[PDB]
């Protein structure tokens, strides 16, 4: 018996909008220490990993573990409901068929109570992260977003390219070509406009722009995006939450 | 010879936007005491009844009765014209072929004068309202609108259900299910957020959500919606105007 | 070797948005005294003539003349890039294959550098303007825009009609008919709301509304539109820039 009460219903809506456009189904493992989730694109080139810790809820109680599969399209239809600053309460009784989402507003009158049917997904859950990534940068999520969006208009493939104190995004298509170079710097008038970079080995990797575009939708959810690149593994783009995170693992393009 | 001068052109535009999306044609009976109108959906499950009394015009003069039929799509194209705070003047000469709509703005320069061709509709006009309805509730039109819109995503049919001091809206579909319960209360910090209910007999009726969705567009036009339900007749949803009203009669779904 | 530096990148974007929707290709002649351009609709009923003088650039240097053809769809994709208040720098080396567009923002970090491939257009450039036009009016570009947009809903053809101190726009279709009359006046509380008219001969001409609609998009670019009509030639609609202009030559409809 689960009873997890988001402070503002807008968060859960947002974390789900954050990543709904790239994957159709999703398995939510609810535990004593919060809910965690994973979603693999059907293409198997993008994985979405989510963690919501207890400190992201106004209240939270999971007596036993529960796994809730659910169609993201359905769940987010239900999440357009209610008002934006209401208490959304996830509820499930043990070994369930239905999760129910229970919205109540700053007065006690509208008791809006939806209930979603659960899909059945098998928990081949993936641990795809690495100890050490060839490079690690970190920049404003809005910035990463303009440069992705901008370059996606030129071809299907954006090429990230990292060399000592130099992070370079590039697209190359029929129209023409595009090239956004950026460099690390601690700015102090807003220590959050900054750009961090740690390089152990230079990288040069290419990515589907389709997917980069899906990934940057997570900017609604943190001011900063951390992206970790490696030749040996999928790249990891990560948006930190209050308690928790939203990760996107993304595989590079071949030749 | 008709010469009816709306104060703000935005009103007539709005009362027509209020109900244009559900019915294609419309017969406007213009009389000494104002204009009244009726429109039946082709499906014959929704009737739209309008009254605009003299106190909704800055000026008004109908020498003899006139009936003006007109295609709502055409009329509302003409009503996108001019500016939003202009004097819109309906004009017709007796036994006419064309209504003309005459827009003029807060300076005397733009004389914008459109003219619409009249369709020919036969006046099988309907008196479908009842003396006593099983129940009568009354709530904020914006509220009724969110709860309609919210539930319409779950199935094609929303089910209203009224029992002593309890008004309950419900939808039930494949996704899952939804249930918004609401209760009467005189609030006094804004006596207009309130919720009134008068029940003589409990009701339980189902409605096309298509149509509920068309109906709530009338919320642009009054802060409050009054809805009157009966087993023996179509339900009546009503938005009050300054002088007049916009009614929707709506028939329930069968089995 | 060209190096032309718009103050705000938004201008070049805007002058191109101003007229991109009517013509697909465009030949930009760059010279010591600025850049000038011409674009003919494939229908050969609309010509677009542009002049950007040196005083529209923060810096400008054209060593030798250069002609740059370019697909407007491609160029404006590139012009959605960067931020709205950045320095956009047109660059070309002599006898080039590629123009490059170089965006930099109010801090020196994002060096965003796109490059467009040039099409090959033959410079059959047109001098289609007249010494004396039957009439010359001049009005607020936003006004000309509402009256165009408004009337276009009634038919495919708007008819301008000028007679001593009387400028009259009219549309006539199946729906009905529309008629916006306007008259000259020096207003002084804003000498820019005014309406000027000079008539040498009355005119009566008809125009594709398609095209009038494309033309009025130039209102983003000047508060005033000047339109010059003649029976013997295409009408000239003109939006003045800081240093330069955007003209539309438009041919009348036959019978």
Author numbering:
A (entry chain A), B (entry chain A), C (entry chain A): 1 to 255
From the reporting publication:
The X-ray crystal structure of the D41A/D42A mutant protein was determined to a resolution of 3.05 Å. The D41A/D42A substituitions are located on the front face of PCNA in loop D (residues 41–44) between β strands C1 and D1. The D41A/D42A substitutions are located on the front of the PCNA ring in loop D (residues 41 to 44), which is approximately 10 Å away from the canonical PIP-interacting region. The global structure of the mutant PCNA trimer is very similar to the structure of the wild-type PCNA trimer. Compared to the wild-type structure, there are significant backbone changes in the structure of the D41A/D42A mutant PCNA protein in loop D. The α carbon of residue 42 has moved by 1.2 Å relative to its position in the wild-type PCNA structure, and the α carbon of residue 43 has moved by 1.0 Å. These backbone changes in loop D and the substitutions of the shorter alanine sidechains at residues 41 and 42 are the only significant changes in the structure of the mutant PCNA protein compared to the structure of the wild-type PCNA protein. One of the three PCNA mutations, D41A/D42A, is located directly within one of the loops that defines this cavity. In the structure of the D41A/D42A mutant PCNA protein, the replacement of the larger, negatively charged aspartate residues with smaller, non-polar alanine residues causes alterations (>1 Å) in the positions of the backbone of several amino acid side chains that line the edges of the surface cavity, including residues 41 and 43 in loop D and residue 123 in the IDCL. Together, these changes result in the formation of a smaller, more “closed” surface cavity compared to the cavity in the wild-type structure.
PCNA is a ring-shaped homotrimeric protein, with each subunit consisting of two domains connected by a flexible linker called the inter-domain connecting loop (IDCL). CAF-1 association with replicating DNA, and the targeting of newly synthesized histones to sites of DNA replication and repair requires its interaction with proliferating cell nuclear antigen (PCNA), the eukaryotic sliding clamp that acts as a processivity factor for polymerases during DNA synthesis. Recruitment of PCNA-interacting proteins to replication forks is generally mediated by a conserved sequence in these proteins called a PCNA-interacting protein (PIP) motif that interacts with PCNA in a region between the two domains on a single subunit near the IDCL. In this study, we focused on three separation-of-function amino acid substitutions in PCNA that cause defective gene silencing and exhibit reduced CAF-1 association with chromatin in vivo, as well as inhibit binding to CAF-1 in vitro partially or completely (D41A/D42A, R61A/D63A, and L126A/I128A).
